[PDB]
Specification:
RNA-binding; 1 chains; elongated; 4-stranded antiparallel β-sheet; 3-stranded antiparallel β-sheet; 2 helices; Ribosomal_uL6_a/b-dom; alpha+beta
RNA sequence: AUCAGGCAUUGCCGCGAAGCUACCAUCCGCUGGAUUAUGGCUGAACGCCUCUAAGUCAGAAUCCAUGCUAGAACGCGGUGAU
């Protein structure tokens, strides 16, 4: 159709700032500061109320208005990242060989050492992305909680940790062994 | 004659340094980036879902480099003495 005009509403919570110039969304909030440049999309933002910001696409398309709702999603994810933040719980699932996971330091860099995964002599090194914090949580045996602000920091840290412990040259339906993201949620309680 | 030699298409036999040479001998043959397949992240389209659409992570003996050989006899630079 080439949609003459379409827009998306982006709500702004009670104690956060949104700084947009030419396409650099810089959200500040109680947790801290998140930056993300959207110079790849070609949309227009407009502050109406200091609490709603309307993002818009003029003479849109099927592939174009899809991105307009995508950018609303990414910007809400940033506001969530500063207001409440993110917290991914992963469980160690092992059949025989218990997974030995701990956070070590190599030249002050924050790695996650994985040793004794299917009794593998290898020591798997998962570099913790800055802004992501690792907690080997008590009260749940064989759990690891990756918390912080930016969803793409938390999610890719959790994903890169899951991917390195993939069993090779086996029936992956019998050898159901590795560290899997059980829960994806927010840091703040009363929820 | 002796000694010492000639000729036998290098007279033949044993040893024979130097030279060349043999997986028949010895030494030596590097580690970064980007990717494919594939598995993923965030994530719309399609109130969910989704690795894909925007963006992105990981990644092969592949590709490009580090390296190695040559050096354009019409590519070039610095320098000496003239």
């Amino acid at each position: 159709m080439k949609y003459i005009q379409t827009e998306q509403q982006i709500e702004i919570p009670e104690g956060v700032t949104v700084s947009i110039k030419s396409r650099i969304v810089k959200v500040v909030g109680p947790r801290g500061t998140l930056t993300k440049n959207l110079k790849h999309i070609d949309v227009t933002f407009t502050k109406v109320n200091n609490q709603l910001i309307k993002v818009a696409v003029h003479n849109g398309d099927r592939k174009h208005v899809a991105a307009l709702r995508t950018v609303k999603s990414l910007v809400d994810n940033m506001i969530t990242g500063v207001t409440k933040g993110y917290k991914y719980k992963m469980r160690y699932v092992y059949a025989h060989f218990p997974i030995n996971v701990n956070i070590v330091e190599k030249d002050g860099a924050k790695f996650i050492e994985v040793r004794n995964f299917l009794g593998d002599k290898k020591i798997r090194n998962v570099p913790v992305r800055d802004g992501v914090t690792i907690e080997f949580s008590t009260n749940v045996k064989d759990e690891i909680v990756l918390s912080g602000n930016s969803v793409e920091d938390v999610s890719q840290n959790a994903a890169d940790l899951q991917q390195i412990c993939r069993v090779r040259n086996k029936d992956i339906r019998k050898f159901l062994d590795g560290i899997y993201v059980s829960h994806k949620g927010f840091i703040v309680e009363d929820e």
